[PDB]
Design an enzyme around this catalytic site. Sequence first.
Site, PDB file in Angstrom:
ATOM      1  N   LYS A 161       0.819  -1.207   0.000  1.00  0.00           N
ATOM      2  CA  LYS A 161       0.000   0.000   0.000  1.00  0.00           C
ATOM      3  C   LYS A 161       0.856   1.262   0.000  1.00  0.00           C
ATOM      4  CE  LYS A 161      -4.097  -1.883   0.026  1.00  0.00           C
ATOM      5  NZ  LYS A 161      -3.922  -3.207   0.631  1.00  0.00           N
TER       6      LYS A 161
ATOM      7  N   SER B 220      -2.135 -12.665   3.840  1.00  0.00           N
ATOM      8  CA  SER B 220      -2.353 -12.590   2.412  1.00  0.00           C
ATOM      9  C   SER B 220      -1.154 -13.179   1.666  1.00  0.00           C
ATOM     10  CB  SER B 220      -2.634 -11.218   1.874  1.00  0.00           C
ATOM     11  OG  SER B 220      -1.598 -10.338   2.230  1.00  0.00           O
TER      12      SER B 220
HETATM   13  C1  LIG Z   1      -3.737  -4.213  -0.126  1.00  0.00           C
HETATM   14  C2  LIG Z   1      -3.499  -5.550   0.374  1.00  0.00           C
HETATM   15  C3  LIG Z   1      -3.436  -6.648  -0.535  1.00  0.00           C
HETATM   16  C4  LIG Z   1      -4.170  -6.663  -1.840  1.00  0.00           C
HETATM   17  O1  LIG Z   1      -3.557  -5.688  -2.740  1.00  0.00           O
HETATM   18  P1  LIG Z   1      -4.566  -4.929  -3.747  1.00  0.00           P
HETATM   19  O2  LIG Z   1      -3.649  -4.212  -4.723  1.00  0.00           O
HETATM   20  O3  LIG Z   1      -5.291  -3.910  -2.852  1.00  0.00           O
HETATM   21  O4  LIG Z   1      -5.470  -5.941  -4.434  1.00  0.00           O
HETATM   22  C5  LIG Z   1      -3.061  -7.852  -0.034  1.00  0.00           C
HETATM   23  N1  LIG Z   1      -2.620  -8.022   1.225  1.00  0.00           N
HETATM   24  C6  LIG Z   1      -2.328  -6.975   1.965  1.00  0.00           C
HETATM   25  C7  LIG Z   1      -1.648  -7.241   3.268  1.00  0.00           C
HETATM   26  C8  LIG Z   1      -2.879  -5.711   1.635  1.00  0.00           C
HETATM   27  O5  LIG Z   1      -2.584  -4.646   2.457  1.00  0.00           O
END
Ligand SMILES: *Cc1c(COP(=O)(O)O)cnc(C)c1O
Lengths: 313, 316
Positions: free
Chosen positions: B47, B270
């Site tokens: 981000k 994630s």
């Molecule tokens: C933002 C986010 C993502 C996904 O990225 P996008 O570009 O928003 O699809 C995945 N995991 C984390 C930890 C995030 O902060």
Amino acid sequence: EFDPRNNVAPSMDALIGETPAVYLKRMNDTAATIVLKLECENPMASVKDRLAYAIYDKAEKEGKIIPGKSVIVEATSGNTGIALAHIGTIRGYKVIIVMPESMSIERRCLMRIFGAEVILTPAALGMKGALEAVNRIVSNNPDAVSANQFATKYNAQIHEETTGPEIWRQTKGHVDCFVAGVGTGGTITGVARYLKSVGCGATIFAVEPAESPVLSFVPEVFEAALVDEVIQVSGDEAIDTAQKLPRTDGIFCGFSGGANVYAALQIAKRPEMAGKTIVTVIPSYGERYLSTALYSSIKDEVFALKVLSAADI
Amino acid sequence: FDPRNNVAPSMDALIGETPAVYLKRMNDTAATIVLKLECENPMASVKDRLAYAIYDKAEKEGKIIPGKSVIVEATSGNTGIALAHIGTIRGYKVIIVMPESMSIERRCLMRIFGAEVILTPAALGMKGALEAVNRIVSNNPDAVSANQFATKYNAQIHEETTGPEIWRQTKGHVDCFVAGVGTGGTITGVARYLKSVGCGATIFAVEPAESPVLSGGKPGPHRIQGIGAGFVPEVFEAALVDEVIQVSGDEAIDTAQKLPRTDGIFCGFSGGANVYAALQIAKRPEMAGKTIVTVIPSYGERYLSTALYVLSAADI
Ligand SMILES: *Cc1c(COP(=O)(O)O)cnc(C)c1O
Ligand SMILES: *Cc1c(COP(=O)(O)O)cnc(C)c1O
Ligand SMILES: CC(=O)OC[C@H](N)C(=O)O
Ligand SMILES: OC[C@H]1O[C@H](O)[C@H](O)[C@@H]1O
């Protein structure tokens, strides 16, 4: 060997070092230029990644350790243990970290996340208890080695070979002053050794806590003859600086980073330092300290925030 | 500039150009897996790029005015941290709105970077935070929403930076790209770039099995912070995506817990989801000898106090 921006690294330990440097901007209201070496950007978020790397790389090159055979043992609750656990698991060494049970559960957890065996020693025995446990483990297992014995041999060396040369390249050979806190003494000793070796006449300042001014124990790694002056910084000064750096400059660091920058700013206010380049170190990333006294005043603030009513939406 | 050889002007100048690493011990397949390490950005997540794009591109469009505009977003996630970080560097006021139930640690991080934090009653959920944002923008002439789920700046930054980086790092060997969808910016922008250079890479989106909305399923609560907003974001371009892979919370967590030990990768939920998905794809015979790229979105230390070791949209 390779530019990480343009290639795929073979492993995470290959991304240790070659950290960026940044000018201090908004917080620097002085006539001097202040350059921060961002050790907080190493993979495990501190300068101690370089020490751990040196230990594994150099001990293996000297045939003192063998992956899958040697067991690396250290008494620590700090970044050195994290970095030892990290590189150990990558290279296939068992790692044993010994610390008092009274140290932060977060630090304990980080060691275990990287598969280190964490040996907890009674709070009532303090660090002595952990050191005694280490002695027993190393003495009784022929395949166990003490990391501290290698750390002592390789610590200043790694900073002379990496941190120092990087600083010299990044500043294009312009260093008038170098300021760093003394933990193990590796960073300040190795950088000052390097700067001396390239004919750089920079003044060398060690930073220590006003509350524990022992340089004014002294680690074996530390070489006092390379240091021109000692700056004492209080806990309150270090904390205040570390709390402001995120807002002024977007720099998120620990206690030691706060102390170093406070010291640099004090030096920079001296008339004779006008127009000079002062280099210091941000040793670790701030996130590891969120639960500590460093940010507890902010934690108290947000804990007490009022919640909007449904009527105010 | 090469950071190895120069001093950066500011911390926002160190965003992007992140490293990449092979997945080795955990990868028992015939495919090569490359991890793009967004966890190495200055504020330890992908981000940082989105926040950089919002301030850089909004100012170039005159949609924010320095010393006047106030940036507002409803988030307790990495987007809020990154907005607060770049905001304070560039001298913009930042207002982060979150339900009172979101992590105190995330609240604290916003405030460390000088953002104002507004708390909304947990009984109103994310809707309550979005309504408060709408009230701020409606009633405050200077307020501009970051609008992370809809802004054109999101996919654009990934098309301009993340995509070209991956292309360079792999020397034009990208057969597959796998990414979890939060805002959808990463997958959309990377796929757009790969399409533009004539790369026929297959594009796989990852979402929680517990909230499989991209697959046409129903929204639900899940533990995979960063992805699975519970709706299809406007930023996301479904036409660029070949397949959606569902990953359970348990699969994501198991993977994230093992990655530190197998490969020294310390990431969030994630990253675990992405790697799990990549390994599932990598088992396919057509992926033998191919290069699969995925993303590690965020550094693990931000997750120490979580379960790792709907409100879903607020965790982005
Ligand atoms: C933002 C986010 C993502 C996904 O990225 P996008 O570009 O928003 O699809 C995945 N995991 C984390 C930890 C995030 O902060
Ligand atoms: C290691 C360390 C220091 C000191 O660096 P040395 O090379 O040990 O002198 C201080 N701050 C932090 C947080 C570090 O981990
Ligand atoms: C302060 C820090 O993290 O490092 C100190 C040293 N690694 C120790 O064993 O305590
Ligand atoms: O600054 C980004 C964070 O992740 C990276 O690993 C750094 O060391 C730091 O802790």
